[PDB]
């Protein structure tokens, strides 16, 4: 799949073939300095946002933490919070998601940050969305 270059936020975009085991999705961009305190990358089924298999949600709030969660039929599940903030307001980042059989692995700036065990079947994910306090340079697929 060809990369999305400079896509405007809020973005959604199709993932050709959907998520498969071993797929790596790179989101390269910049956290805005003064344009809010949260952003999210969502791996979801379709364009509606009611079914998000993996919501990855850094929050520059309450000391800095990242929320990982799943939305199913419009309902959010129990949050998994990583109380580390690997991003910095105003700074560029490279975020890479590795789809594995049991979990997503998430690397930030070349370092494994968190894993998230699948709560719903990943093959059903065919869409990536990004919203919030970020500007995107590219989203690429291998
Ligand atoms: C202590 C505790 O449990 N705290 C709870 C809060 O964490 C919780 O806040 C919600 O948490 C979930 C994750 O669990 C999400 O981050 C909710 O944020 C919403 O996220 C969605 C998906 O990114 C986003 O919807 C998208 O918006 C874009 C436009 O930007 C477009 O419309 C898309 O189609 C759509 O999917 C939505 O805007 C966003 N809202 C906010 C306010 O950030 C987050 O609210 C709350 C409420 O569930 O419960 C506390 O108890």
UniProtKB/Swiss-Prot annotation:
Subcellular location: Cytoplasm; Nucleus; Secreted
Domain of life the protein comes from: Eukaryota
Amino-acid positions noted as binding a beta-D-galactoside 1 in the UniProt annotation, renumbered to this chain: 42, 55, 59, 69, 76-82
Tissue: Peripheral blood leukocytes and lymphatic tissues. Expressed in lung, liver, breast and kidney with higher levels in tumor endothelial cells than normal endothelium (at protein level). Expressed in trophoblast cells in decidua and placenta in pregnancy (at protein level). Isoform 2 is the most abundant isoform expressed in endothelial cells. Upon endothelial cell activation isoform 2 expression decreases while expression of isoform 3 and isoform 5 increases. Isoform 4 decreases in pathological pregnancy.
Triggers of expression: By toll-like receptor ligands zymosan (TLR2 ligand), polyinosinic:polycytidylic acid (poly I:C) (TLR3 ligand) and lipopolysaccharides (LPS) (TLR4 ligand) and by pro-inflammatory cytokines IFNG, TNFA, IL1A and IL1B in mesenchymal stromal cells. By IFNG in macrophages. Up-regulated in dendritic cells following infection with dengue virus. Up-regulated in Kupffer cells following infection with hepatitis C virus. Up-regulated in plasma following infection with HIV-1.
Residue ranges occupied by any Galectin domain in the UniProt entry: 11-142
Role noted for this protein: Binds galactosides. Has high affinity for the Forssman pentasaccharide. Ligand for HAVCR2/TIM3. Binding to HAVCR2 induces T-helper type 1 lymphocyte (Th1) death. Also stimulates bactericidal activity in infected macrophages by causing macrophage activation and IL1B secretion which restricts intracellular bacterial growth. Ligand for P4HB; the interaction retains P4HB at the cell surface of Th2 T-helper cells, increasing disulfide reductase activity at the plasma membrane, altering the plasma membrane redox state and enhancing cell migration.
Entry domain remark: Contains two homologous but distinct carbohydrate-binding domains.
Quaternary assembly: Monomer.
Name of the protein in question: Galectin-9
Native source organism of the sequence: Homo sapiens
Gene: LGALS9
Section of the entire sequence shown: 7 to 148 of 355
């Amino acid at each position: 799949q060809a990369p999305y270059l400079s896509p405007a936020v809020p973005f959604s975009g199709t993932i050709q073939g959907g998520l498969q085991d071993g797929l790596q999705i790179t989101v390269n961009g910049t956290v805005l300095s003064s344009s809010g305190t949260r952003f999210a990358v969502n791996f979801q089924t379709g364009f509606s946002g009611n079914d998000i298999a993996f919501h990855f949600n850094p929050r520059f709030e309450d000391g800095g933490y990242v929320v990982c969660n799943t939305r199913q039929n419009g309902s959010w599940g129990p949050e998994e919070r990583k109380t580390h903030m690997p991003f910095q307001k105003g700074m560029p980042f490279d975020l890479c998601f590795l789809v594995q059989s049991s979990d997503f692995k998430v690397m930030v700036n070349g370092i494994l940050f968190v894993q998230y065990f699948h709560r719903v079947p990943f093959h059903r994910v065919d869409t990536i969305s990004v919203n919030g306090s970020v500007q995107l340079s590219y989203i690429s697929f291998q």
